[PDB]
Amino acid sequence: PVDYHLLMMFTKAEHNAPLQAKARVALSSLLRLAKFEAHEVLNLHFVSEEASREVAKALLRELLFKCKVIFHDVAVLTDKLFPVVEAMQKYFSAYYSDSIFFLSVAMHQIMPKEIPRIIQLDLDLKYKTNIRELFEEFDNFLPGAVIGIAREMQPVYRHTFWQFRHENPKTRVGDPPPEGLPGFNSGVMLLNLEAMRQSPLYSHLLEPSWVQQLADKYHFRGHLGDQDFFTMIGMEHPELFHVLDCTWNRQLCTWWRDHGYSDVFQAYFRCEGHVKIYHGNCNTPI
């Protein structure tokens, strides 16, 4: 048998109608279109609390290749994360309870060594293709590339990196694609735990003094959590990241188009081609 792992955040879903609607659109599209071979098996991980764990199990019954469903305890992962991720919530969430928002960053240390690869996914997504196809992007990784991640389709990182761009007028940090680095979106993340455990550079970029050094270089104080870490790391060492085509995560949020970036917005939001996964971020309907 061959294992394919997906991870999803499903916290505070109890008495949440907007969230449960999203998780219905997401999980229904995922499973209705997901097709695997008979020997191999799809593993669906969830980090949820006892309360939302019930909500998930109840939702999966309506929608059930074998597909094993694993539930991770929110508190257990948080408690495991905290000693590793304390020194970077003061830069990317600029107190203890909010350690679970940096899960992707330390996925290799939290997950068992038995798991070599995982795809962490948002629940405001809509799947337009078979999810087995996305796993094929792992093969397109360069050696020394640890994370598969789609680029950010809003000029958020213009505003976040403002002081660095103010000081470096020639920089590509915060610039639109294809010539510039717009930053990353955390909605669809291909985490190569095997590569993460083995990459010395990534092992060092997780350390406090390194984080401090790099945040200070970019004058970085963000609020986007794990997404902020990868994005900032992506500016220094872009080769750690395998940039997924925009069609694998087409964010639909247009907030910044109407709140300051009307002119440059398109250069970030643009994504030509047949969409494979939609991302209805900032509550944008699909």
Ligand SMILES: O=c1ccn([C@@H]2O[C@H](COP(=O)(O)OP(=O)(O)O)[C@@H](O)[C@H]2O)c(=O)[nH]1
């Ligand atoms: O109350 C919540 C809200 C969100 N999420 C999860 O965290 C992810 C990030 O939230 P959201 O989609 O709002 O992020 P955005 O893409 O809007 O920045 C979602 O996909 C959900 O899986 C959660 O567990 N509880």
Ligand SMILES: [Mn+2]
């Ligand atoms: Mn989202």
